[PDB]
Design a protein around this nucleic acid. Structure first.
Lengths: 122, 130, 198, 32, 48
RNA sequence: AUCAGCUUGUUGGUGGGGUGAUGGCCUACCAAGGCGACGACGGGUAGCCGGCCUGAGAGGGUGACCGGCCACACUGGGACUGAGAUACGGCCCAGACUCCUACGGGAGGCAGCAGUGGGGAAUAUUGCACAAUGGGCGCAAGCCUGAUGCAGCGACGCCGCGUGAGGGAUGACGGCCUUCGGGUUGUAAACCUCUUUCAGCACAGACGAAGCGCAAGUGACGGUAUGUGCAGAAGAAGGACCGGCCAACUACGUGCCAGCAGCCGCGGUAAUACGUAGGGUCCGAGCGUUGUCCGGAAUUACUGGGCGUAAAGAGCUCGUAGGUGGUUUGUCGCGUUGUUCGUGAAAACUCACAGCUUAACUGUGGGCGUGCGGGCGAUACGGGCAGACUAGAGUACUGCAGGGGAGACUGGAAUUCCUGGUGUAGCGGUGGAAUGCGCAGAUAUCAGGAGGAACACCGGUGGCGAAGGCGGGUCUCUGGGCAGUAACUGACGCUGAGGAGCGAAAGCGUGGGGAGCGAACAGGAUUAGAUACCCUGGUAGUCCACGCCGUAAACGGUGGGUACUAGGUGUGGGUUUCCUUGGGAUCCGUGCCGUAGCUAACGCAUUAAGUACCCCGCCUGGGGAGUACGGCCGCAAGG
RNA sequence: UCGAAGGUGGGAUCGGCGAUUGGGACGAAGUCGUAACAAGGUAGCCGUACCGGAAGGUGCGGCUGGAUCA
């Protein structure tokens, strides 16, 4: 607007808007899991979601969601947390890899098959 | 009063939009050259220069068609003070695919886009009319 | 628009002349609250045209979908619109505006293809163009981009018309490449036309 | 426009004013 | 595309003190004569 | 700039010194500057580039391989040697660490190639050769070379090839649906011929070497590549997805569960959206996920956006830097432009061609290298200089209108109290009442007195002021506007980041004043309950003097300037032509209606939100929040 | 003379933790009222001051993004 006003100062982009604060710009981080409690979502979607809060190696304290039917992980398992997005429980935006370092792949999973980590039938 | 030629072409867009027969202007050299170009391309019909309060004046009659329809389908000042747009010879910007014309004031005077192309000189634009 | 494939032993399906190209752009059920509930109706934005470059724009209101489509066909039938071209291209870059609909319609060299979004792609696929280059800026809609595209095609004019407005002998109105494209397109009009006579 | 925007803004403003009533003293002394 | 007017406070060397404030002096690039005195001026045009 | 001042070898001079060379590089004296809102000095991050990725381009991201520069070599100083030094595998010192020691003292330095531990989501062998190319020393032979040449390892990437071909039914077995007819898998399979790349086993076996060598030999890769043979369909397919976008649907199983999901959203016993099955679709030695970037995003809009009500016009002016500039003659050639020279290494990129069975790949020749510097040319436009002009701007002169402002003096009606009459039981108040004032003489009425504040009527869609704002009168001092003439000056204009000034009400300080009204504060009433409305009382305040504060729906929700674009009708100020106050024409003002044009719509519409130019402010989803932190101003409230 | 490390000193500045405390976001479903939207039952809103368990109430000036029309 009034191009000398842009020669003075103007027209810069807004903000990087970083999605995940896992850290480092790293795709997945292994982590020590603690207190694997099960929660209640927002009002149109009522169920019990199986989350676990994980202390990423990156020293931060986050809370990840465990996809699949059940979780092999108990207290102090070395779960490999990737970044995802679950709308449904507020503040949980990370998903634990199933078929990983500690948490075994989902058993009798026969159709989804890459997610949930089920190895092929012999 | 900050731009002379913007008031010129502005007065041609208003007098063209409001179905006028003629228009009156403060005469100057650059407006005389632009009036001579728009004579030579036929966007206006003819202009005459009067003597008036103090200075001379430019009375342009506008060229209409087979009914009330207009020949100048627009003006747009591009080499405006504050962002005076310069043009090398590679491209005298083509206007409306070539159907419109570009009043370009090179070192040889004032030319159109086509004359700036063939004679091999560029160095300005001014407003371009279609 | 379902269950159209049918064979009838009746009087006639009344198939006849004017086998034009007809495109249905969008259908959104339009609701109206009245005392005790909602009254659903239907709007069909109907594009019709022939491959010369004559375009219609129809806007059908009915509480059935093929009824609204047929009323859009009859309304665009009532209201056609001539589009000037060069070969199968467009003449020169324009911008059309229907109150929020911005569409830039720019020509291109032949072979490129109609590159436009779905509303402008509909209005240009019904028309006589095969190779132009458009874009729909603003308003993110179907009705305003169709109507803005038709206003953009109203800002078109012939090279000859421009020459006529300025009282100048062509050559003197166009540049030369576009006159050569006039020679190419009229030459293939002569070839396919004289192959049409025999 | 609507007065709803105006009133949400004003709710914030009110709450803040109250918060400075009650902490007035405390801000003076904790600051000094 | 705005044609920006910019300034440049160079430093320059008069042996004879021929120039004063407000003048139209010439310049020419030299050897580095001190810490940022890299110009000497010949044929001063107009005095004030 | 939530970092505004920093600097004393710091800025310049002279004499020395030092250096390969100029020089606060150094030193003694002398002078006292220098650098900064074109962001100095500080803070944060970062090797820079040819390039790469993305994109229509403009631009955005990035700096891996390959190539060019720079900086460093355990951390931090220092010189020496030398043509040349951050001296990685040199020296000296001080540290931190590892190790040897007979305790006196020594030794180390993978950010060379391998390799180990650690950290990590994650990144390879303690390989073979100097045959080729580069490098060193040597007369040469030759010797050295973890540069390089190659090999190993990982679908880590890009490209190519394979897992067969042809025949084959009114379409078998099996599977799952079904309207119980059948339908799909499916020409697919079994079978019947045929062909074998690539893996397999044989035998032959390179080019890279117009090389080196005076020796007779010499290829690390290598018995590899590649040939010619033999046997036989023979050893060779998977992953995602099938509500919508978005190519692709049916059944069974659980029925707000278990789960799904990129967003919209699917699960509450008939889910094409969850799990399994058939089937389909899309890719294919891969296919999905996560992360990071560009794109779509015209969603920071130079190209290419906006600000009446959607986010967005500073409360209003004056003015510093800045940006911008009417008419016209000359000159300069700084912007602009034309042309030629030089340069923009190679590679990449693009076009053509050649080479490898093709391709990726590699090479040759153009173009690209959007730029910069030198020479020569042009002078319309911008600018500089030197001039000229009167239309913008300002001044003089003649009038004219006005709650423009400040100071001073004064006027009456009304309310309240006071003294005194006249005079009695109620007055006041309300939707209805009661607290309340009365019976000690109220309210009522008459006379007089005090005191304060506000100015009925004129007076309204009206005047003036930049905006707040301004109405009893008179006087004194002072500001602006408008018109007319054109007498003068001669572009002195416009805007204006920061900056100073003015700025309702409430509030604040010190000193006055205090009738009416009146937050807070009481009582009464209403009510479930009123911390409320309504009633009775009532302090700060409202008023004046002197200062603060700086805020408002400070609103035309519309920054300032300028030119133009059909009209119609009111009213305010002033000039003139005509009828002779009426009408016209004109300049300035303020309203109502209305075309064109504009707008998302309502609306605006010569007083633009229309058509254009100049400068400023400001906006970038909603909350969080005009809040924290920090600073500035303020007596504080707070801004 | 210069001089790295070391020592003493008082500060700048960037953070981490801190008992307690302020507010903020989300949760359903709880308690209390009903402030706003219709003249929302006292038109609403802006500034400011004061008060109140809370929404709020009142004063002073302003505004139509106000209503019916005395």
């Amino acid at each position: 607007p009034t191009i000398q006003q842009l020669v003075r100062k103007g027209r810069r982009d807004k903000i990087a808007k970083v999605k995940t604060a896992a850290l480092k710009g790293s795709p997945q981080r292994r982590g020590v899991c603690t207190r694997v409690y099960t929660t209640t979502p927002k009002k149109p979607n009522s169920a019990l979601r199986k989350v676990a809060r994980v202390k990423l190696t990156s020293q931060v304290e986050v809370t990840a969601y465990i996809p699949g039917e059940g979780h092999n992980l108990q207290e102090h398992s070395m779960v490999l947390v990737r970044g995802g997005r679950v709308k449904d429980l507020p503040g949980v935006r990370y998903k634990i890899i199933r078929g990983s370092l500690d948490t075994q792949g989902v058993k009798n999973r026969k159709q989804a098959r890459s997610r949930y980590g089920a190895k092929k039938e012999k | 009063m900050t731009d002379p030629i913007a008031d010129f072409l502005t007065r041609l867009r208003n007098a063209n939009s409001a179905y006028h027969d003629e228009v009156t202007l403060p005469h100057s050299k650059l407006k005389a050259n632009i009036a001579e170009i728009l004579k030579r391309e036929g966007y206006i019909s003819d202009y005459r220069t009067e003597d008036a309060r103090v200075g001379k004046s430019l009375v342009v009659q506008l060229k209409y068609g087979p009914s009330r329809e207009r020949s100048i389908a627009g003006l747009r000042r591009v080499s405006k003070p504050g962002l005076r747009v310069y043009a090398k010879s590679t491209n005298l910007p083509r206007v409306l695919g070539g159907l419109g014309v570009a009043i370009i004031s090179t070192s040889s005077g004032l030319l159109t886009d086509r004359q700036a192309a063939r004679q091999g000189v560029g160095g300005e634009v001014l407003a371009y009319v279609w | 628009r379902g269950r159209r494939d049918d064979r009838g032993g009746r009087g006639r399906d009344g198939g006849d002349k004017s086998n034009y190209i007809e495109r249905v752009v969008s259908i959104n059920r339009v609701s109206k609250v009245v005392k005790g509930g909602r009254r659903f109706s239907f709007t069909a934005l109907v594009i019709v045209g022939d491959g010369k470059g004559m375009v219609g724009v129809g806007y059908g209101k009915a509480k059935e979908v093929p009824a609204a489509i047929a009323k859009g066909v009859e309304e665009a039938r009532k209201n056609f619109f001539r589009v000037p071209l060069i070969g199968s291209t467009i003449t020169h870059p324009v911008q059309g505006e229907a109150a929020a609909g911005v569409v830039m319609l720019r020509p291109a060299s032949p072979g490129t293809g109609v590159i436009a979004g779905g509303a402008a792609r509909a209005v240009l696929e019904c028309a006589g163009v095969h190779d132009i280059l458009a874009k729909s800026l603003g308003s993110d809609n179907a009705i305003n981009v169709v109507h803005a595209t038709v206003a953009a095609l109203k800002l078109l004019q012939r090279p000859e018309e421009v020459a006529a407005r300025r009282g100048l002998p062509i050559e003197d109105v166009a540049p030369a490449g576009m006159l050569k494209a006039r020679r190419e397109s009229e030459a293939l009009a002569a070839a396919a036309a004289r192959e049409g006579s025999a | 426009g609507s007065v709803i925007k105006k009133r949400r803004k004003r709710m914030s403003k009110k709450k803040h004013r109250k918060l400075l009533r009650r902490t007035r003293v405390q801000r003076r002394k904790l600051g000094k | 595309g705005k044609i920006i007017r910019t300034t440049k406070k160079v430093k320059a060397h008069d042996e004879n003190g021929e120039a004063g404030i407000g003048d139209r002096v010439s310049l020419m690039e030299t050897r580095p004569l001190s810490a940022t005195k890299r110009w000497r001026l010949v044929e001063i045009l107009e005095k004030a």
